[PDB]
Tab-separated table of C-alpha atoms in Angstrom:
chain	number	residue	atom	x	y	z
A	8	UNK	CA	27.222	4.070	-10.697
A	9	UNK	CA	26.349	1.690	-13.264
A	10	UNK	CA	27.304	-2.225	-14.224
A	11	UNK	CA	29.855	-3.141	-16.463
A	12	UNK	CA	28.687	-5.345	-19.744
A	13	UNK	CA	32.280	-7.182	-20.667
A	14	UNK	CA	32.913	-9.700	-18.134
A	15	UNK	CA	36.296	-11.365	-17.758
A	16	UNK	CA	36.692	-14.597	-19.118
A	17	UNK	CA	39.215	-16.094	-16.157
A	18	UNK	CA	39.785	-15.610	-12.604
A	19	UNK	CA	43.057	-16.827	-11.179
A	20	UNK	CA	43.929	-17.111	-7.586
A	21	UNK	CA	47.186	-15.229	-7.121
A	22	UNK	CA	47.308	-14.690	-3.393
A	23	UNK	CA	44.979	-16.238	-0.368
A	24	UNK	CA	43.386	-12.414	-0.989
A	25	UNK	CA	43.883	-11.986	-4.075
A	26	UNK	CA	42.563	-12.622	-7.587
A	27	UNK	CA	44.106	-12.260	-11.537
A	28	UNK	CA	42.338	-12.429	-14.660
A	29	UNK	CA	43.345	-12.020	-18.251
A	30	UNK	CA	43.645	-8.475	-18.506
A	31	UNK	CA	45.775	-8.400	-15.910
A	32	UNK	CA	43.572	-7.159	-13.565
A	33	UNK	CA	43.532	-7.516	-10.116
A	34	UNK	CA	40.460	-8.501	-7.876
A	35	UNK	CA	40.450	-8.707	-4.464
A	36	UNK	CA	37.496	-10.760	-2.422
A	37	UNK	CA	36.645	-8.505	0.480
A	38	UNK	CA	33.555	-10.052	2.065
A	39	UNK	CA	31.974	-13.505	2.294
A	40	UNK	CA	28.208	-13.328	3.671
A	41	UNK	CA	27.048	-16.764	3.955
A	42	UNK	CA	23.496	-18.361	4.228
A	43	UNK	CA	23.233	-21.708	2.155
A	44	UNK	CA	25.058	-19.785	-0.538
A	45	UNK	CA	27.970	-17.284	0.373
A	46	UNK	CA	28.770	-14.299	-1.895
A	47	UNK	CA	32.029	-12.872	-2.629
A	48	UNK	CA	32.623	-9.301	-3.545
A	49	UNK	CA	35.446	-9.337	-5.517
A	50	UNK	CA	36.958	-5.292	-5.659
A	51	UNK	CA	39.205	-4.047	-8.724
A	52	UNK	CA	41.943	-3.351	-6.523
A	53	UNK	CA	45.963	-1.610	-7.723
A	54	UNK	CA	49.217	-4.007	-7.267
A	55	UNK	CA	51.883	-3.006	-6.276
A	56	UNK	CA	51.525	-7.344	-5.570
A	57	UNK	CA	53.432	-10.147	-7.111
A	58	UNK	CA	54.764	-13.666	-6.610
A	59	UNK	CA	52.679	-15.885	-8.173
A	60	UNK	CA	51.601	-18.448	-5.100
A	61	UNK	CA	50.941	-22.121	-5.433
A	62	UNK	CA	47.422	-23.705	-4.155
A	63	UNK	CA	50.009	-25.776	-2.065
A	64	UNK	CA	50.851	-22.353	-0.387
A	65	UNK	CA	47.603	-20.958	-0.095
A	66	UNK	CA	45.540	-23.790	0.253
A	67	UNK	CA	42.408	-24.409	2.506
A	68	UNK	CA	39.633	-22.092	1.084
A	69	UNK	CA	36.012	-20.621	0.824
A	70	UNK	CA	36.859	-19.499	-2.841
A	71	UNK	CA	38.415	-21.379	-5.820
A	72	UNK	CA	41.502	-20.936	-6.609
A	73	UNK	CA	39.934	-20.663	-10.557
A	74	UNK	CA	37.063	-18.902	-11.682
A	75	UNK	CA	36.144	-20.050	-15.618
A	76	UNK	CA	33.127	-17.986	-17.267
A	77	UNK	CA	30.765	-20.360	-19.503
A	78	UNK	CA	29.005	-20.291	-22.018
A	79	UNK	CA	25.683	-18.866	-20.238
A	80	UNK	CA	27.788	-16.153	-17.890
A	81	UNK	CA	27.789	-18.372	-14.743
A	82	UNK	CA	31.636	-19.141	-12.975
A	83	UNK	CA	32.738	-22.270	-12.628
A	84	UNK	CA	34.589	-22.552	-9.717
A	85	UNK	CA	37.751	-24.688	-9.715
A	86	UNK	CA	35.958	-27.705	-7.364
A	87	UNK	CA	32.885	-28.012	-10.496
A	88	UNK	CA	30.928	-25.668	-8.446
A	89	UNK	CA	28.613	-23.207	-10.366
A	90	UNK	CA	29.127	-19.179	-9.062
A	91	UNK	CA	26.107	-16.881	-10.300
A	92	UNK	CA	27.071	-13.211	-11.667
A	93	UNK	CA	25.199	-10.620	-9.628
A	94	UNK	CA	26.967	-7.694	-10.688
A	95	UNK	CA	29.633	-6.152	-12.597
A	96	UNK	CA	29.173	-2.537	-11.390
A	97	UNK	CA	30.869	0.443	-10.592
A	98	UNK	CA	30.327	3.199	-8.279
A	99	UNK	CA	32.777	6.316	-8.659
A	100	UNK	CA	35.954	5.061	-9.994
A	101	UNK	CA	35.332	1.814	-8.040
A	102	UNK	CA	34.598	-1.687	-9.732
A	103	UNK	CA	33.326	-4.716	-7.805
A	104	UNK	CA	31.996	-7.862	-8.988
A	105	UNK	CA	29.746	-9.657	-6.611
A	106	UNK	CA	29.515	-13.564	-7.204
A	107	UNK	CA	26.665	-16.042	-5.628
A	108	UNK	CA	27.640	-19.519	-5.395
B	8	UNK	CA	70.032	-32.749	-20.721
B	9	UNK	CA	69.366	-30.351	-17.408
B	10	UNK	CA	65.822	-29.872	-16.513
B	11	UNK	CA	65.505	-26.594	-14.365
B	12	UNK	CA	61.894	-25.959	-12.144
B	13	UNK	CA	62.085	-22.641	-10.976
B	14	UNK	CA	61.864	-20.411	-14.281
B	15	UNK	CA	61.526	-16.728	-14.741
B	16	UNK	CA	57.987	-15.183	-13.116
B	17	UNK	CA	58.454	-11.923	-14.980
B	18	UNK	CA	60.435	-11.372	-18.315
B	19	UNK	CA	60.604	-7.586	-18.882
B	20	UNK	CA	61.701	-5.992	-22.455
B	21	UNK	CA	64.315	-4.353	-22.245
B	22	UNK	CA	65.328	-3.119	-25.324
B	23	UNK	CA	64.806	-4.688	-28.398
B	24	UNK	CA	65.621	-8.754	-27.917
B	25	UNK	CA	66.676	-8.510	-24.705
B	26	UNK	CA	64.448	-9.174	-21.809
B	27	UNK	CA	65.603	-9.341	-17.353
B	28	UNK	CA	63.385	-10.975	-14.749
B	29	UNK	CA	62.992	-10.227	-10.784
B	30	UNK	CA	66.771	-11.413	-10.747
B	31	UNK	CA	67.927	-9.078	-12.993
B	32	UNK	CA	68.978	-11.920	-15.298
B	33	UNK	CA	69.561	-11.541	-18.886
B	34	UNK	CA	67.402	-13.825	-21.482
B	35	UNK	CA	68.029	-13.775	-25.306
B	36	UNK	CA	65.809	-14.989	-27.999
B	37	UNK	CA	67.729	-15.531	-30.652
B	38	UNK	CA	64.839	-17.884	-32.546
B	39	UNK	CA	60.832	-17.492	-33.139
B	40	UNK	CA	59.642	-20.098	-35.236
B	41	UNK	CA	56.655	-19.375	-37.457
B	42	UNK	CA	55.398	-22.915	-37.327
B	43	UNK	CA	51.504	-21.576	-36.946
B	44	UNK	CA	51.553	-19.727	-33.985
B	45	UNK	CA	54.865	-18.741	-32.264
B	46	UNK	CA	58.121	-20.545	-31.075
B	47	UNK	CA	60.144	-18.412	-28.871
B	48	UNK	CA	63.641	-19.838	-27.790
B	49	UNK	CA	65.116	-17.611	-24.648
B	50	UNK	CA	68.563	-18.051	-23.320
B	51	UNK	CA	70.308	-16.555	-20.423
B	52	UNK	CA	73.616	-14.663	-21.197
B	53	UNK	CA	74.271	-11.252	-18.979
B	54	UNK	CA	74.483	-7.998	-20.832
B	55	UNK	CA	76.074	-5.203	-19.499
B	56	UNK	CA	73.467	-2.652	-19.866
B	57	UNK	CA	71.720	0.553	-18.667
B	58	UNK	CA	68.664	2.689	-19.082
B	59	UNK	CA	65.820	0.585	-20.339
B	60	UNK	CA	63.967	1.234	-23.629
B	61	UNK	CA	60.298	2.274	-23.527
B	62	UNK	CA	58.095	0.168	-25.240
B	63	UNK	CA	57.642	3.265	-27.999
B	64	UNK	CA	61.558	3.281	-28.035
B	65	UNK	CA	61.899	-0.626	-28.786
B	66	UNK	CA	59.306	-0.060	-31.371
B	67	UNK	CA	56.306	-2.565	-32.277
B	68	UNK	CA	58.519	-5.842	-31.390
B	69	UNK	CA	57.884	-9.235	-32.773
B	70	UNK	CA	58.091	-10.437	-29.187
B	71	UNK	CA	55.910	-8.044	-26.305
B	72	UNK	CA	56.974	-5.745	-23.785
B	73	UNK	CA	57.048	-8.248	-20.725
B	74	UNK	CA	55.767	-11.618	-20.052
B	75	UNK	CA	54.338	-12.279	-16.464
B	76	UNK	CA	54.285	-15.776	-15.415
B	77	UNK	CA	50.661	-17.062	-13.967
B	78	UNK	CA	49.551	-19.636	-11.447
B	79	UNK	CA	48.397	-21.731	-13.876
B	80	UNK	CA	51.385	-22.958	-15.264
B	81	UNK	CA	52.273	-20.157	-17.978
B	82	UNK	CA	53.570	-16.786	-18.953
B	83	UNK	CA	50.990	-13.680	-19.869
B	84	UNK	CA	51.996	-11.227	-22.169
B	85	UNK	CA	51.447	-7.601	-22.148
B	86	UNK	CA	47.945	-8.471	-25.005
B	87	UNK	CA	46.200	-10.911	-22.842
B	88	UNK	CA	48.427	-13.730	-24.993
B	89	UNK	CA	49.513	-16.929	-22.603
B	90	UNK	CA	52.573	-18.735	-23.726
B	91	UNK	CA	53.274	-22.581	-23.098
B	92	UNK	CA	56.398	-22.474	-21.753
B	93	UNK	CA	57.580	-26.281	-22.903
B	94	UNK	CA	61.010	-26.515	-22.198
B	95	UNK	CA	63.248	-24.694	-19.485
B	96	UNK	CA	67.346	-26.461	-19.532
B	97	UNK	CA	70.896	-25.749	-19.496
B	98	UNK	CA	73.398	-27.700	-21.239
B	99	UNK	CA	76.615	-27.176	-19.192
B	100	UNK	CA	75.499	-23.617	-17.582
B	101	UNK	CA	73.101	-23.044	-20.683
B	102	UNK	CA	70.157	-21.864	-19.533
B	103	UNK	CA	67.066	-22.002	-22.298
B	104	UNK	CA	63.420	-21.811	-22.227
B	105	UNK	CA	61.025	-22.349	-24.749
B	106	UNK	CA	57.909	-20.358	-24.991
B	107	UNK	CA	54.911	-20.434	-27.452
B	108	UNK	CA	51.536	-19.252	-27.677
């Protein structure tokens, strides 16, 4: 039930739903909570997925279709928008990543 | 002399030197070039073949297990490696790619 140090360094849009990074790893955004700043809780999810989709095929969005780590840990979304780290947890066998634009 | 667009989204190893993609198409590298960092030239030619080799099996390869092509405009391989892939052609039905890290 605890938070996970090593953070990956990219997050690619693959699907609307669905996000890679460089290990390969899939992330899925399951809930947006909004109140100036929405939050996206981004679940290690199995695939079992492929096809890698074009922006032009996704393509109006609450969520960037890249997610760059910098320097100081924050994302950088694709639009130059800055996405706080508020976790990297896990709670039994499930790992979720919770980002605060 | 033939620029093709829609290249391979997943090159699977096969045995060793010889990869398929989602079509079940045959590529070949038959050159790496050590300039630096790596050169890989892939062709298409079919292969009759059977039973694919386990990565054990095709032993510690110069080239990886399978490339997976990303949204961002390149191929990942199986080591969290991205390869430029800088040229895809055919020269009267001669498909080739080039791909470098």
């Amino acid at each position: 039930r605890a938070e996970t140090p090593a953070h990956p360094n990219r997050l690619w849009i693959w699907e609307k739903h669905v996000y890679l990074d460089e290990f390969r790893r899939s992330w899925l955004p399951v809930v947006i909570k909004s109140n100036e700043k929405f939050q996206v809780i981004l679940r290690q999810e199995d695939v079992t997925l492929g096809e890698a989709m074009s922006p032009s095929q996704l393509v109006p969005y609450e969520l960037p279709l890249m997610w760059q780590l910098y320097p100081k840990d924050r994302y950088r979304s694709a639009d130059s928008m800055y996405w706080q780290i508020l976790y990297h947890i896990k709670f039994r066998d499930v790992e979720d990543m919770l980002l605060e634009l």
